[PDB]
Design a protein around this nucleic acid. Sequence first.
RNA 1: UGGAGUGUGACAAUGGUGUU
RNA 2: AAACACCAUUUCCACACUCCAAA
Length: 804
Amino acid sequence: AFKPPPRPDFGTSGRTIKLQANFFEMDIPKIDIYHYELDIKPEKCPRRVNREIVEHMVQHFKTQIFGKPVFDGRKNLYTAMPLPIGRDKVELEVTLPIFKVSIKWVSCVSLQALHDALSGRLPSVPFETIQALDVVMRHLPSMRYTPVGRSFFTASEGCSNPLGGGREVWFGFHQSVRPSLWKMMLNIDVSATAFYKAQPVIEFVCEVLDFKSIEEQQKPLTDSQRVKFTKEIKGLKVEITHCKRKYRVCNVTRRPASHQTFPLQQESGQTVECTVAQYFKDRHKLVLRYPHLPCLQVGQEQKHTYLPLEVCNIVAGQRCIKKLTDNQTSTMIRATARSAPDRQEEISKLMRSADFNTDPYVREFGIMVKDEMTDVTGRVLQPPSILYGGRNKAIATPVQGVWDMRNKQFHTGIEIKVWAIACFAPQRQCTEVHLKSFTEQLRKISRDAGMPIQGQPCFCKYAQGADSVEPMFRHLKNTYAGLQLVVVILPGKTPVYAEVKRVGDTVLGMATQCVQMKNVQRTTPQTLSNLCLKINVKLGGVNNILLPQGRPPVFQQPVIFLGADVTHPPKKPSIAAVVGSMDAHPNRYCATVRVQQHRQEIIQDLAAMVRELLIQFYKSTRFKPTRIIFYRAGVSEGQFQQVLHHELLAIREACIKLEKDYQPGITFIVVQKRHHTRLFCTDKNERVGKSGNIPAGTTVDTKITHPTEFDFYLCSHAGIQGTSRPSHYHVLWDDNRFSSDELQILTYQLCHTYVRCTRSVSIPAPAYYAHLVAFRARYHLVDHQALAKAVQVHQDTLRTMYFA
RNA sequence: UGGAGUGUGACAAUGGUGUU
RNA sequence: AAACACCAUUUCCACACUCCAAA
């Protein structure tokens, strides 16, 4: 439970399709770079200030040292060539129009060892080296561009994209140095956001108050205009233009600049009441062109510092946080999240205009970055045949990641005979005609799907308030003998839903299916169809199964599939969810949920949860799992060592405390949808749909993947909009010795066992379900050992997929 | 609360050190 | 205790959009 397994082989299954990844090949020398620790007092200075101080320190000490270093922004410094130092601390002083800096030697970072790591020589890739390289590549844009989070943003060179108000669209990119099979690469992905336009505040007023010009009104702002302008500018920073000095607007004056007064404190004799306009006329010899406009209150309210709008400009680099209107959000997405070819060209254009090969700090370390994206082979896996079981038992073949139930019926359809209707929406906007039409349409779609509604509902009443839920359900459960479903019509976002699921899933164990109000008024066969999918699953039926004869050889022996996800509170306990397959299809899943420490992603009580699932598996299959496939979802790379250490043992522990010496093979896999890796089709004819993304089933385990360990990218879904995010799978452990092809096909096949739609999903079904179970348990909570029993679902609910 | 996809948040939340 | 800086963590969740209902 310490070391992750090496990649066994390279996959050869599926049709090859020429691809390009957003990785850029780097040429790195064999030179050893020198690392030094800095010590700067005071110890609270911002990163930008630190880089500024170091920059001054470089040029002012050229006679002694620096015969061109890079900086972290925080106490870490690197140089290409060595300098006159030692292990001893070298302290000096600098001045910025006053700091004390101490430079200390740390260690040497050899890039020869990096080549040994990328080659077959050394197994471990030095993290300190990756850090150093990343600091180098980020040193210039950290000062040249505007850093946001881990990305760098900037304005537009030519065409300035506006948004209205004081906002505009700034574009940016996220860079990161990553190790590869043979050569180091630079991962880069573009993005966009909204910044405040660098313009005079007098024009900011014009754009906010919808003025063509400022001379449109000579009369002062009405109270509504003052509030509106204040709402937009309160908090922003502005620079002055009659001396430079940057200020922060805390408020907007009520009175005009001609009447706004303040304590003048003219040397001796203390304060005299003076207006702002008179001050700028006397002191700065400036007559106000627009004295009828209010002033910007700056700094401390006790300080009484005011500024006329015509001497203030809004400083650039200020990202917007305010709510975006319809036109703003539209223009945003109408300029971002574009199609795959568009994003592709954007990254290419970026890599062209960024010009890493001409920047001095990059050239200093003799680093060369390829200006073209990395070509990668890639291969599209073969979609599994989905077997439906009507009278004809037709088969659905996933075309482009999507299939349908046309002339097809469920593998195991349930004859719904007893069901109820409880509408919580007002009857005024939801008539009985709507309910009957919805009933007719549902009955038709249901019977066509293989899950026939044998007749009208035994119950149909309007209601209101969450307090009506728990009592009514009890009455419903005691009145009608053997009801199968309770349909709850909701008028939108309401606390009613949470209690419906609480009473339904935990308290009584009644199969409930909520429907939004609008879908009852106007009904489309597609919506009702997907709804039927949910119902049939919630009632214990089987929508569809994988083709038994068309499965990887792992199914030849009893194997259980596990999915795990963790959800954290907005101080409240977190909840971890672990699901497990309960048949050999694998269609049916059982859910286990626990409560945990705040924001602890490491599943603590996992062992007991696995034990429950294993026992339940045996009770449902009469077979003991020879294999365990654990799809962990939600953890990042920085948590791997921790998670893999505890959770793997927790799984193994559960297998020991259960029965004798029963130790099946555990395959620990980490699913990751959140990463800056993009994939594009090289051939224009290979593009799929409007979005023009890679075809569903695209598999990549070369060039852009880990040099030694077992990982692979798998785009298992078809891109509906924008650019697809290929789900990354990293095998942290494997006792069963899976081959690349087998595990990838198995994963891609489990992406077809999703029961809520007739499509291929981005992540495997167990991981998706586990996320659903967690997010469902989120509603059950709405003192620790008390709420611990709140997530404990019903006895009869346990044997079902309520989370669907 | 029919479903899937992908955009935004990073002056975010907390515990920590520290400031007139 | 009120703001304000910085260090290590937290991709949780929220909102929005697109498509399945046209030919």
